[PDB]
Amino acid sequence: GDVVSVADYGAAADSGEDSAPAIIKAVDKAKELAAEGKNVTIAFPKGRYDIYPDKAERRTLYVSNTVGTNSSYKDKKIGILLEDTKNITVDGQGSDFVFHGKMTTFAAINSRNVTFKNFSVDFQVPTVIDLTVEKVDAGAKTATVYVPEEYNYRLSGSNIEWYSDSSPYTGATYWTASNALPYVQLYDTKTGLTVRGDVWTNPIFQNVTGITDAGNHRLVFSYSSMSDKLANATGISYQMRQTTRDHPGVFLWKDKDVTLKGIDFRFLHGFGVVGQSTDTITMDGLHFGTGEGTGRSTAGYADFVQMSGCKGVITVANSSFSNPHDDPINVHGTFLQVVEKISDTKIKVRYMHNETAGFPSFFVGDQVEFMTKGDMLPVSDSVRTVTAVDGPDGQGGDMGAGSGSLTDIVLTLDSAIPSAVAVNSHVVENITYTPEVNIHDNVFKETPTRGILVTTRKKVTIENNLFDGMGMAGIYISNDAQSWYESGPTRDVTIRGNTFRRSGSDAILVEPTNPTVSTTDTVHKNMTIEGNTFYVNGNRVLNAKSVSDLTFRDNKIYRENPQVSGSRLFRLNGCKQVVFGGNTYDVGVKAGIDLANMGASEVNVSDDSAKVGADGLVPL
Ligand SMILES: OC[C@H]1O[C@H](O)[C@H](O)[C@@H](O)[C@H]1O
């Protein structure tokens, strides 16, 4: 069909003009034709574009894993919004979008078959101030601080003030701030490794007797004392930020068959790409991170890809992540916990985490399973259909009769509930919103947190990925109704092809948060782990916890660096039907296995040179 262009409504490529009123005009046009039946392709004549929040769309939104029922941060601000429509494909043709203030960069709601392709995303003054410490001198107690061009500032002797550009409609400034920001993170520009440190103490901002400008973007900080940290500080990018997920980066809440291709995510404000209930998602050729031509150290405010409680097939292909303030991909759901039995067919359940609430997670016709929090094992034959939902609607409204608070939902099940269910004792899980997952040919580098996180009972493939500098657990498969309340239990996890290296901690770490371990029945069933090359410096390759019919074959392990401590490569807590079979353990590695709440009658190293309980240190 037809191809509408932003050019005709006021989008002037390379103008520094609010292109957001024009966008909102063109998206209306785009809906009219689509609703006639067409296949609109909103196109952006190539070049820069400025998008300010002033006249952007304002929507009330409770999003997963942001700020839950906070009333300050309810009404968000999308810049490119595809609400209730179909068959639209937004093509920036390689343009560089640059947003302003604090806003959601683009969203899609109540849509089916829309696509975003081929453009850049950045912010004019980033909301995460990354200062590098270039030199320091312990003598007269001074320091040097590189602050990139992107950040605007103004000094008043002992104190420093940061601010943003102004609002072209009011002449007013979008965010002001001072000295140390609440939370801070560290990436070593030289050694290239993200060693986080006490995120509440920023040694740049301690006893600062006076700040002077050395020109050329530098800064000379005077000091009273100067502790161990501030001295060794040479070459560390202290990435200052705040810990309020006030906006999602991208929002995709109730969509069907979206695609995100070829978007350079140079910076997002607020969070990452929140998908929150969506039948299928596909994410090719994305690049999260900045470049070395830039002086920026983080393209993440926190997460990058969040897929809270989605369906169909979540796909991440041919992409790339570098230095976030949270994980790259975390696919999951959310456990709500039963806080009342209104009938043998009617229950009230509650959003038990403060950062996740507000939106509805159950839809009439859906299917819920029940779960005992103790072992995090599912109640036998508890699976049920939902017949009426009385909750919030995620826009601050009512669904059905209502629930009376954004933290509670009221469900009615097709048949009476299994009798074992008890208030505050069992959590409930929406099993219909369970995404199959395919994560292939991506690269993740220098993250401080984990690499991937996937917790779903549909098929799970993680094939031919490169993990380098994973500062924590390379891959983490949790499932947890203790603290975080992120569902759920996995059932088909295959982890082929990948290459791990320079891991700071474990590589693969399955670890439900069940406080009662069970040695008769296990939380996760079925898992295969093969084709993989691993590079270790005396670390755990696998760290199971309540897995069954687990397999660790065909892999290869080498000592990273060209008698001893350093963990045995394998640790298993409460597992069944494990097998090992045909691996390649380098000389010097501790090719052994630690059991725990578990007996060696459950391991099959008959076809393998791993040792159950011994170091098994490989010789020449
Ligand atoms: O479980 C780790 C934790 O990591 C981040 O903080 C996310 O925001 C949470 O939703 C959770 O995924």
| Closest C-alpha to 511, from 529, 532, 490 | 490
Q: Are 574 and 515 in contact (CB under 8 A)?
A: no
- Domain shared by 120 and 236, yes or no: no
> Residue 483 is which amino acid?
S
Question: Which residue has a Cα nearest atom 10 of ligand 1?
Answer: 65
| Closest C-alpha to 327, from 61, 65, 63 | 65
Q: Cα dist. 522→19, 51, 373, 414 in Å?
A: 54, 51, 13, 28
Final residue of a structural domain among 366, 395, 430 = 430
Q: How far apart are CA 299 and CA 372, in angstroms?
A: 39
> Does some domain include residue 620?
no
With a CB cutoff of 8 Å and minimum separation 6, the contacts of 271 are 63, 65, 66, 245, 247, 248, 249, 301, 302, 303, 306
- Domain shared by 58 and 25, yes or no: yes
Give distance in angstroms: CA of 164 to centre of ligand 1: 29
Q: How far apart are CA 307 and CA 324, in angstroms?
A: 16
Q: Cα dist. 205→222, 223, 394 in Å?
A: 10, 9, 40
* Residue that has been written with the tokens 């999260």 in this structure: 288
- Domain shared by 586 and 443, yes or no: yes
Final residue of a structural domain among 241, 271, 299 = 241
> Does some domain include residue 618?
no
- Domain shared by 48 and 177, yes or no: no
| Closest C-alpha to 337, from 486, 216, 188 | 486
Q: Is 511 in the pocket of ligand 1 (CB under 6 A)?
A: no
Give distance in angstroms: CA of 324 to centre of ligand 1: 12
> Does some domain include residue 281?
yes
- Domain shared by 306 and 351, yes or no: no
Q: How far apart are CA 536 and CA 557, in angstroms?
A: 7
Q: Is 480 in the pocket of ligand 1 (CB under 6 A)?
A: no
| Closest C-alpha to 381, from 411, 406, 418, 413 | 418
| Strand pairing category for 452-454 and 329-332 | parallel
What SS3 class is residue 10?
coil
> Does some domain include residue 503?
yes
Q: How far apart are CA 50 and CA 52, in angstroms?
A: 7
Give distance in angstroms: CA of 318 to centre of ligand 1: 24
Q: Is 66 in the pocket of ligand 1 (CB under 6 A)?
A: no
CA 205 to the chain's CA centroid? 29
Give distance in angstroms: CA of 341 to centre of ligand 1: 30
The two tokens of residue 140 are: 């007269």
The two tokens of residue 240 are: 């200052």
Pocket test for ligand 1, best of 63, 65, 273 (most atoms within 8 A of CB): 65
Give distance in angstroms: CA of 370 to centre of ligand 1: 23
Q: What is the CATH number of the domain that holds 376?
A: 2.40.30
- Which atom of ligand 1 is closest in space to residue 453's alpha carbon? 12
Domain span holding position 374: 336-430
> Does some domain include residue 359?
yes
* Residue that has been written with the tokens 């990452």 in this structure: 272
Give distance in angstroms: CA of 64 to centre of ligand 1: 11
Instruction: Determine whether the annotation assigns residue 296 to a binding site.
Output: no
Pocket test for ligand 1, best of 67, 243, 276, 327 (most atoms within 8 A of CB): 327
Q: What number of other Cβ atoms are within 10 A of residue 232's Cβ?
A: 12
- Domain shared by 10 and 89, yes or no: yes
Q: How far apart are CA 317 and CA 286, in angstroms?
A: 8
Give distance in angstroms: CA of 471 to centre of ligand 1: 15
| Closest C-alpha to 372, from 411, 409, 419 | 419
Question: Which residue has a Cα nearest atom 11 of ligand 1?
Answer: 484
Reduce the secondary structure of 558-569 to three states and give it as a string. EECCCCCCCCCC
- Domain shared by 109 and 258, yes or no: yes
- Domain shared by 219 and 349, yes or no: no
Instruction: Determine whether the annotation assigns residue 450 to a binding site.
Output: yes
Q: How far apart are CA 222 and CA 212, in angstroms?
A: 8
> Does some domain include residue 254?
yes
- Domain shared by 299 and 417, yes or no: no
- Domain shared by 118 and 137, yes or no: no
Q: Look at the chain and report how many structural domains it folds into.
A: 4
| Closest C-alpha to 54, from 84, 99, 7 | 99
The two tokens of residue 229 are: 């940290």
Final residue of a structural domain among 211, 241, 271 = 241
With a CB cutoff of 8 Å and minimum separation 6, the contacts of 484 are 353, 478, 513
- Which atom of ligand 1 is closest in space to residue 245's alpha carbon? 8
Q: For the chain, what's the residue count?
A: 620
Instruction: Determine whether the annotation assigns residue 326 to a binding site.
Output: yes
The two tokens of residue 390 are: 């009385």
> Residue 1 is which amino acid?
G
* Residue that has been written with the tokens 């560290």 in this structure: 186
> Residue 247 is which amino acid?
H
C-alpha radius of gyration, the chain, whole number: 26
> Does some domain include residue 426?
yes
Q: What is the dihedral of CA 265, 267, 272, 274, to 10 degrees?
A: -60
Q: How far apart are CA 486 and CA 361, in angstroms?
A: 13
Q: Is 330 in the pocket of ligand 1 (CB under 6 A)?
A: yes
| Closest C-alpha to 131, from 152, 148, 109, 107 | 148
Pocket test for ligand 1, best of 242, 326, 331, 480 (most atoms within 8 A of CB): 326
> Does some domain include residue 331?
no
- Which atom of ligand 1 is closest in space to residue 65's alpha carbon? 10
Question: Which residue has a Cα nearest atom 5 of ligand 1?
Answer: 326
Torsion-angle region of 344 (φ positive above 0: left; ψ -120 to 50: alpha; else: beta): alpha
The two tokens of residue 275 are: 């998908």
Q: How far apart are CA 222 and CA 289, in angstroms?
A: 33
Q: Are 490 and 479 in contact (CB under 8 A)?
A: yes
Give distance in angstroms: CA of 540 to centre of ligand 1: 22
Q: Are 42 and 6 in contact (CB under 8 A)?
A: yes
Reduce the secondary structure of 271-315 to three states and give it as a string. CCEEEECECCEEEECCEECCCCCCCCCCCCCCCCEEEECCCCEEE
Q: Is 118 in the pocket of ligand 1 (CB under 6 A)?
A: no
Q: How far apart are CA 409 and CA 401, in angstroms?
A: 10
Q: Is 455 in the pocket of ligand 1 (CB under 6 A)?
A: no
Q: Is 326 in the pocket of ligand 1 (CB under 6 A)?
A: yes
- Domain shared by 493 and 592, yes or no: yes
| Closest C-alpha to 249, from 277, 269, 275 | 269
Question: Which residue has a Cα nearest atom 7 of ligand 1?
Answer: 65
Question: Which residue has a Cα nearest atom 8 of ligand 1?
Answer: 65
Instruction: Determine whether the annotation assigns residue 441 to a binding site.
Output: no
Question: Which residue has a Cα nearest atom 6 of ligand 1?
Answer: 326
Q: Are 256 and 287 in contact (CB under 8 A)?
A: no
- Domain shared by 419 and 321, yes or no: no
Instruction: Determine whether the annotation assigns residue 375 to a binding site.
Output: no
| Strand pairing category for 320-322 and 398-399 | unpaired
Q: Is 65 in the pocket of ligand 1 (CB under 6 A)?
A: yes
* Beta strand ranges found along 502-604 (DSSP E): 508-510, 527-529, 533-536, 542-543, 550-553, 556-559, 570-573, 579-581, 584-585, 592-596
Q: Are 543 and 510 in contact (CB under 8 A)?
A: yes
* Residue that has been written with the tokens 């410490």 in this structure: 133
What SS3 class is residue 23?
helix
